[PDB]
Write a protein that binds this ligand. Structure first.
Ligand SMILES: *[C@@H]1O[C@H](CO)[C@@H](O)[C@H](O)[C@H]1NC(C)=O
Ligand SMILES: *[C@@H]1O[C@H](CO)[C@@H](O)[C@H](O)[C@H]1NC(C)=O
Ligand SMILES: *[C@@H]1O[C@H](CO)[C@@H](O)[C@H](O)[C@H]1NC(C)=O
Length: 209
């Protein structure tokens, strides 16, 4: 015998976040809570159970309707090919497995804006500093390139980049003028690029002297 399977499962891959979510399976009002089990496979490996010792988080017999793989070190290596599966359970009864499309985090990720954008005005310059959208420890596998879009109000937009640094100088600017700008990252991976979201517009006046 068989329970109904969870509907509309989704995988969120945003910056460093990895979260599987799904809609609850509700049986009769009188039934005790349904629980869920998540498993994962690396290409053609065994089906691993998503538990603290296999991936860093406990998504076995949970009542919650999500498995956040990076909530605690935890999570899938970003170049690993991963297939997730999910089911509902009530004791020894369970649903069929719902199997997700495979992903690789670098292939499938949505890249957010650089954060902590800090601008130090100079006489004819603005120095722009910011944090990467997320940390990539192995620099030889993947890296970010950055672009700054900037303009005077009502002017035509200019673009500087790409550059690898987390600091960039906009030079040869007019003194005592307001420049508005947005920073954007592009992720490069040697198997692919992802274009990141633009930061919010912020505006700075260059120094007089
Ligand atoms: C990822 O692995 C799946 C099988 O689990 C395979 O069908 C797919 O082609 C693989 N993707 C890549 C990019 O190797
Ligand atoms: C995993 O989390 C659930 C939710 O509290 C808990 O009941 C279950 O026994 C946990 N299993 C382990 C091995 O920690
Ligand atoms: C990841 O990207 C590839 C497109 O290159 C696609 O085949 C695959 O279905 C995507 N996976 C997910 C889970 O979005």
């Amino acid at each position: 015998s068989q329970l109904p399977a969870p509907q509309h499962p989704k995988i969120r891959l945003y910056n460093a976040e990895q979260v599987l979510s799904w809609e609850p399976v509700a049986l009769s009002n009188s039934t005790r809570p349904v629980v869920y089990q998540v498993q994962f496979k690396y290409t053609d490996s065994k089906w691993f159970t998503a538990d603290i010792m296999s991936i860093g988080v406990n998504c076995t017999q949970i009542t919650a309707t999500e498995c956040d793989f990076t909530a605690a070190s935890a999570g899938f290596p970003m170049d690993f090919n991963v297939t997730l599966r999910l089911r509902a359970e009530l004791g020894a009864l369970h649903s069929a497995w719902v199997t997700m499309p495979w992903f690789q985090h670098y292939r499938n990720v949505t890249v957010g804006p650089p954060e902590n954008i800090e601008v130090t005005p100079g006489e004819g310059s603005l120095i722009i500093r910011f944090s990467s959208p997320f940390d990539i420890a192995d620099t030889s596998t993947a890296f970010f390139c950055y672009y700054v879009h900037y303009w005077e109000k009502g002017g035509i937009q200019q673009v500087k980049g790409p550059f690898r640094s987390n600091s960039i100088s906009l030079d040869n600017l007019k003194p005592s003028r307001v420049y508005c700008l947005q920073v954007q990252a592009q992720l490069l991976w040697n198997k692919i690029f992802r274009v990141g979201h633009l930061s919010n517009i912020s505006c700075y006046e260059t120094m007089a002297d």
